[PDB]
Write a protein that binds this ligand. Structure first.
Ligand SMILES: [Zn+2]
Ligand SMILES: [Zn+2]
Ligand SMILES: [Zn+2]
Ligand SMILES: [Zn+2]
Ligand SMILES: [Zn+2]
Lengths: 57, 81, 126, 109, 105, 100
């Protein structure tokens, strides 16, 4: 259960449907879907890296 | 404001369930199309209103019912927008 | 009681919330051509699939087989609802990419059903 | 032999105003090396601080002994900071090039 | 119930299952919650007597001990025709009572 | 009342909470479904034209409060009898009944 205390509140997320699905404004710094999936894939990869580099040393 | 929006969701819930309830923004056209269609259904249902209409026009009852079913599509003309 | 009885209310029971699907069918701006009806028995699908895969892959910047197969699964029914498909993709893609995406996938399926072979015009060419 | 809520970051209340940077680091640096110190500028936050220790055990010890210390004739209130949220995006491009340089360096995958 | 505005009825198409009432709810009307003049028997929809839930209370959900009726006034107004009258959500009052006793006890 | 007269008793509109041996619950059958109140109105209630007219005690001549009773509460308590039929339900040889 303690795993729910590891999770932190994410930064601001974007709403695609807001204002009739308008063209998204650049430099808004709101995460979209593809930003989220990149971060998820990137942390999976980073832990694979540390798990590999653990066994070497 | 929020009370306006909660009234709005409740009334569209009703209108889906019972076809033909209104809300504060029912137009004339909508109200009258509902009461035309309800009238047609009522005429089909009662046997003696349907007899009366089949006598007053010299038609058979099957023709009368079929014409009433044809009128159910646009009973009051096209939508007014 | 194997689960609780209480599981939340469904949308048919609860009047406190408005119908979000109808509301989005009003306010999103859909592409020009999506009103034309499509029959999928008249369309060949597996020739359509690699273009979709490639199209989604470059829009996304990576490949998501769940979005891919989701799009494919929506096209399995006989008359696919195009407006719901643009809504259901708007979350994953920009909502501007979803509009463009339907705007090219839909006339392509129209061209496919007009053919006898099942194949749209630009794919008969090439 | 530690509770899960222990953290490297400490939050400090009742800090006398315009205390020096040197005096701060000297007070908090006894328990271990210090990763970073942030001091509140805005007047609603003014007079309170965050201190990050490089070691988790030093931060544990500084909470355990630091509390109720008397600096500038006032008691010092120390707590753990609960880093419960993130304030910016994690900048996938920098993390990508960093991981590419590590993986290139050790031939991992 | 009529005393709780946030409670919600099932209202699906009722079936051949007879709804029942636990000892606490015995003798009252499911809709308007009265004690007098019982007119008609309550029928519940299929899902609401699925499985283990077969035979629980309509109004609260406890072990049912007698049959539930509509009163005469709900029959005359045809409130007995709206659907399955099983209450599908606990509501704020029931939940608050639990946490309050648990805090104390 | 005595045991044979208890079919002449009136019932309370609300059902009894102790269900066993009740006369007004659904299971007992004394609370019937689809009751028309106008048809069952004169049952076990006073009706000056009907069969239960306003009676007085046969002994003290003061008015009873229960339909179909021939003895007022005090006289029935003191003599030990059923208020409706007058059969004795209590042996009062050793009881100094006190009206106080
Ligand atoms: Zn109950
Ligand atoms: Zn009722
Ligand atoms: Zn139900
Ligand atoms: Zn008397
Ligand atoms: Zn008797």
């Amino acid at each position: 259960k303690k795993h729910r205390r590891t999770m932190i509140i994410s930064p601001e997320r974007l709403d695609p449907f807001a204002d009739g699905g308008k063209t998204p404004d650049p430099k808004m710094n709101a995460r979209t879907y593809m930003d989220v999936m990149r971060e998820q894939h990137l942390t999976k990869e980073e832990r694979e890296i540390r798990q590999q580099l653990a066994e070497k040393a | 404001m929020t009370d306006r929006y909660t009234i709005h969701s409740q009334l569209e819930h009703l209108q889906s369930k019972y076809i033909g309830t209104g809300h504060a923004d029912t137009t004339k056209w909508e109200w009258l199309v509902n009461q035309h269609r309800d009238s047609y259904c009522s005429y089909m249902g009662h046997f003696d209103l349907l007899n009366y209409f089949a006598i007053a026009e010299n038609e058979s009852k099957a023709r009368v019912r079929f014409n009433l079913m044809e009128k159910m599509l646009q009973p009051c003309g096209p939508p007014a927008d | 009681m194997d689960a609780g009885f209480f599981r939340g209310t469904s949308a048919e029971q609860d009047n406190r919330f408005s119908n979000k699907q109808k509301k989005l069918l009003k306010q999103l701006k859909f592409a020009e051509c999506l009103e034309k009806k499509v029959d999928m028995s008249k369309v060949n699908l597996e020739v359509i699939k690699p273009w979709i895969t490639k199209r989604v892959t470059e829009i996304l910047g990576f490949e998501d087989d769940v979005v891919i197969e989701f799009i494919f699964n929506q096209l399995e029914v006989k008359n696919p609802d195009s407006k719901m498909m643009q809504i259901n993709l708007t979350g994953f893609l920009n909502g501007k990419n979803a509009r463009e995406f339907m705007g090219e996938l839909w006339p392509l399926l129209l061209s496919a059903q007009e053919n006898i072979a099942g194949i749209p015009s630009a794919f008969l060419e090439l | 032999r530690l509770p899960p809520e222990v953290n490297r970051i400490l939050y400090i209340r009742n800090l006398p105003y315009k205390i020096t940077a040197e005096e701060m680091y000297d007070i908090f640096g006894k328990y271990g090396p210090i990763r970073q110190i942030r001091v509140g500028n805005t007047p609603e936050t003014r007079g309170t601080a965050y201190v990050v220790y490089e070691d988790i055990f030093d931060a544990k010890n500084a909470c355990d002994h630091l509390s109720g210390f008397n600096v500038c004739n006032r008691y010092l209130v120390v707590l753990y900071y609960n880093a419960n949220r993130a304030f910016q995006k994690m900048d996938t491009k920098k993390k990508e090039e960093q991981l590419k340089l590590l993986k290139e360096k050790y031939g991992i995958n | 119930a009529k005393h709780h505005p946030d409670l919600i009825f099932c209202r699906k198409q009722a079936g051949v299952a007879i709804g029942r009432l636990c000892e606490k709810c015995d003798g009252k009307c499911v809709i308007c919650d009265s004690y007098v003049r019982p007119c008609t028997l309550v029928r519940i929809c299929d899902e609401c007597n699925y499985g283990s839930y077969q035979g629980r209370c309509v109004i609260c959900g406890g072990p049912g001990v007698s049959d539930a009726y509509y009163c005469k006034e709900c029959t005359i107004q045809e409130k007995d025709r709206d659907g399955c009258p099983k209450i599908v959500n606990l509501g704020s009052s029931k939940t608050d009572l639990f946490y309050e006793r648990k805090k104390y006890g | 009342v005595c045991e044979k007269c208890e079919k002449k008793l009136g019932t309370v509109i609300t059902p009894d909470t102790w269900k066993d041996g009740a006369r007004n619950t659904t299971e007992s059958g004394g609370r019937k479904l689809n009751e028309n109140k106008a048809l069952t109105s004169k049952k076990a209630r006073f009706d000056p034209y009907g069969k239960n007219k306003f009676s007085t005690c046969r002994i003290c001549k003061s008015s009873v409060h229960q339909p179909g009773s021939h003895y007022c509460q005090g006289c029935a308590y003191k003599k030990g009898i059923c208020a409706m039929c007058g059969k004795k339900v209590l042996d009062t040889k050793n009881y100094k009944q006190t009206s106080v």
